[PDB]
UniProtKB/Swiss-Prot annotation, chain B:
PANTHER family (alphabetical): O-METHYLTRANSFERASE CICE, PUTATIVE (AFU_ORTHOLOGUE AFUA_4G14580)-RELATED
Family to which the UniProt record says this protein belongs: Belongs to the class I-like SAM-binding methyltransferase superfamily. Cation-independent O-methyltransferase family.
Any one GO molecular-function label of the UniProt entry: protein dimerization activity
Alphabetized Gene3D superfamilies for the sequence: 1.10.287.1350, Vaccinia Virus protein VP39, Winged helix-like DNA-binding domain superfamily/Winged helix DNA-binding domain
Protein name: Aclacinomycin 10-hydroxylase RdmB
Keywords from the named record: Antibiotic biosynthesis, Lyase, Methyltransferase, S-adenosyl-L-methionine, Transferase
Organism: Streptomyces purpurascens
Keyword Lipid metabolism: no
GO biological process, one term: antibiotic biosynthetic process
Positions annotated to bind S-adenosyl-L-methionine: 155, 174, 197, 224-225, 239
Catalytic activity field: 15-demethylaclacinomycin T + AH2 + O2 = 10-decarboxymethylaclacinomycin T + A + CO2 + H2O; 10-carboxy-13-deoxycarminomycin + AH2 + O2 + H(+) = 10-hydroxy-13-deoxycarminomycin + A + CO2 + H2O; 10-hydroxy-13-deoxycarminomycin + S-adenosyl-L-methionine = 10-hydroxy-13-deoxydaunorubicin + S-adenosyl-L-homocysteine + H(+)
């Protein structure tokens, strides 16, 4: 029988089971403490309570002092590229969603998401009704592609981007390859952002917005179909529905590109972020992060065979991902 | 100038809200205990009545962070902390059916706490902490059990550190289910004892003293320590009570104990009371301080702060000694006061 050491207990108490310190980091972010300090009178907070928070933040290595952030505390500076202050801000969509993890017990007992239980509407319904949440989710997901540079667009003519958000990805591709036509299928919230983006980029004559629902048949065919960070939002059954719609819209010899986190044994990818994202998808909306082999197996159920595979990743966060290219089997 | 390791620390540790909830779900489901009695994944799911694919995704996260390995699926060395018999009792403290981890979930309201100075517990659970315990019996039971666990010998600290040969009557004010008082009584067979507590702990203490052979000299009085105390005594004990309360409420309790003190009596205060010299881990000072604030509006006080508060109630410090948990990294102080 293994015997925990004092260091194991330390790790459990200060790190793995510590719920207080992540909330203290979020409250600090939401208070812009690091920023508002690079500027009693401190925030709209109760001063003795704020001092008690800062004592904690000092001990865990965020602040020090002449009260100053540490080298680590400079991650909550609004200027830092990794944008952790916005990620942690309690008014933003991700931190707001993170609080639903206090319902993790029912999630694990049932596999059903917790988001609506804390807040009333499902995730996407909530983003559509709450402009503030939608705006912040937009800014976290769209700061700083991949397919525009990874893929040979000279042999493509029409790209259909299924659930392509505010059209950022489709715009990068279309600016890159002036000969391309494009269609974006999205819900009304993101459909309008993308409409405005395409008109601003001088793309409206060849890149169109087809507002709709990717659980219905797609309105057009194309020789490249893009699914960028869509499948991980959905259960296996829903994800198979989406993929079959995509297959139906593929033209002869067309290709389907799935951009997603798709782990391979022995790639360099940090499995912590794999599981963190996987539990977020489970808890926020009942999705699931799938490995390379699981995506390939699900795509095979939809009549697709893997043609090629490429990797990319974030330029401000420690997160690598893949682009998987599929062809129709017959 | 943040390094790459800095960002790793923020994402995996300091800002990570997911892993601590996974630990609490793991403890609640007793996963490690099920693994230690015999494993497969689907068997684990049936013994825990959980969704099989969701449990597998929880276990994969637990594997990555070092609580589980295998899958044969088994606890790591660190994961053995979640075995129900481990002396530090972290499975029970993390159990979402127990009072402490239940209250921890109110930390989602920490923003309001820093804005207003008021606790978050009622904002989540409808009524404040002590109110909720008196109305929810299973919650109240789990809390008393967490406080009274005898794996940690901290409860023997007064019995071992103090000289009881001349003491005639000890009054333990808020003494839980009586563990501390029983320890003193067993070391000083001449002594008489009185315990004042809420209805739940008071009956658990009545049972303790009966089973121990102590009922003839240690009596229990269900009471409110915001109301005059029912007996006087030459030693009064206040063990980890004051930190649950605001300065105004703590002072009312202290004044109540003063009036209970017989002439030349001693008040013993056990609490966490940091001193700038000492080497006690300020992580646990601040963590417990934010829990008292968030759960009930309490405050962890330094030694100077306790001594100042006691001086307002008419008490001067006679002596001070360090003690500590024998299972957790948690030193504390025994502060002796005289009128
Ligand atoms: C695992 C740690 C992570 O850094 C944080 C994170 C994250 O918290 C979420 C999502 C993520 O993709 C990620 C990843 O971070 C990056 C990856 C993206 N490719 C993109 O580069 C952007 C910068 O976010 C990983 C989502 O994709 C997401 C979502 O998809 C529509 C819906 C709701 C919540 C999240 C959600 O909370
Ligand atoms: C930080 C490490 C620690 O284990 C954590 C801890 C703690 O988290 C809490 C409480 C603690 O007392 C403690 C400390 O435990 C001490 C106090 C007792 N004499 C007890 O018998 C034990 C042997 O040592 C220390 C409470 O006492 C408490 C409470 O008291 C009424 C009400 C709500 C939450 C806590 C609460 O969360
Ligand atoms: N039934 C549905 N039909 C079409 N789009 C949907 C949808 N349900 C969710 N979505 C869209 O799915 C998207 C997932 S996230 C946006 C990912 C985007 N392609 C990118 O890489 O940046 C959201 O924009 C959401 O509006
Ligand atoms: N109004 C009140 N009157 C009497 N006891 C109270 C009380 N409010 C809270 N308490 C008791 O205060 C105690 C604080 S925690 C238990 C501390 C105990 N002396 C020990 O060292 O183990 C709890 O047992 C709780 O029941």
């Amino acid at each position: 029988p293994l015997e925990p050491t004092d260091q194991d207990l330390d790790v459990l108490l200060k790190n793995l089971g510590n719920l207080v310190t992540p909330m203290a980091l979020r409250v600090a972010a939401t208070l812009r403490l690091v920023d508002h300090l690079l500027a009693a009178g401190l925030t709209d907070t109760h001063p003795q309570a704020l001092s008690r928070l800062v004592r904690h933040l000092t001990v865990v290595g965020v602040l020090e002092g002449p009260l100053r952030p540490t080298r680590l505390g400079m991650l909550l500076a609004d200027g830092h590229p990794a944008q952790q202050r916005a990620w942690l801000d309690l008014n933003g969509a991700v931190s707001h969603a993170d609080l639903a993890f206090t319902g993790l017990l029912d999630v694990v007992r049932t596999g059903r998401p917790a988001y609506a239980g804390r807040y009333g509407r499902p995730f996407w319904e909530d983003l559509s009704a709450d402009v503030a949440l939608a705006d912040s989710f937009d800014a976290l997901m769209s700061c700083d592609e991949a397919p525009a540079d990874a893929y040979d667009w000279s042999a493509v003519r029409h790209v259909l981007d299924v659930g392509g958000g505010n059209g950022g990805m489709l715009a990068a591709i279309a600016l890159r390859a002036p000969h391309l036509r494009g269609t974006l299928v999205e819900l009304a919230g993101p459909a309008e952002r993308a409409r405005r983006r395409f008109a601003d980029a001088g793309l409206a004559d060849r890149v169109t917005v087809a507002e709709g629902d990717f659980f219905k048949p797609l309105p057009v065919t194309a020789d490249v179909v893009l699914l960028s960070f869509v499948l991980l939002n959905w259960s296996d059954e829903d994800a198979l529905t989406i993929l079959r719609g995509c297959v139906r819209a593929l033209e002869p010899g067309g290709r389907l590109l799935v951009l997603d986190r798709a782990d391979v044994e022995g790639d360099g990818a940090d499995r912590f972020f794999s599981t963190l994202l996987d539990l977020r998808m489970l808890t926020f909306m009942g999705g699931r992060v799938r490995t390379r082999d699981e995506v390939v197996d699900l795509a095979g159920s939809a009549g697709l065979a893997l043609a090629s595979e490429r990797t990319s990743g974030s330029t401000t966060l420690p997160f690598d991902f893949s682009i998987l290219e599929f062809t129709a089997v017959s």
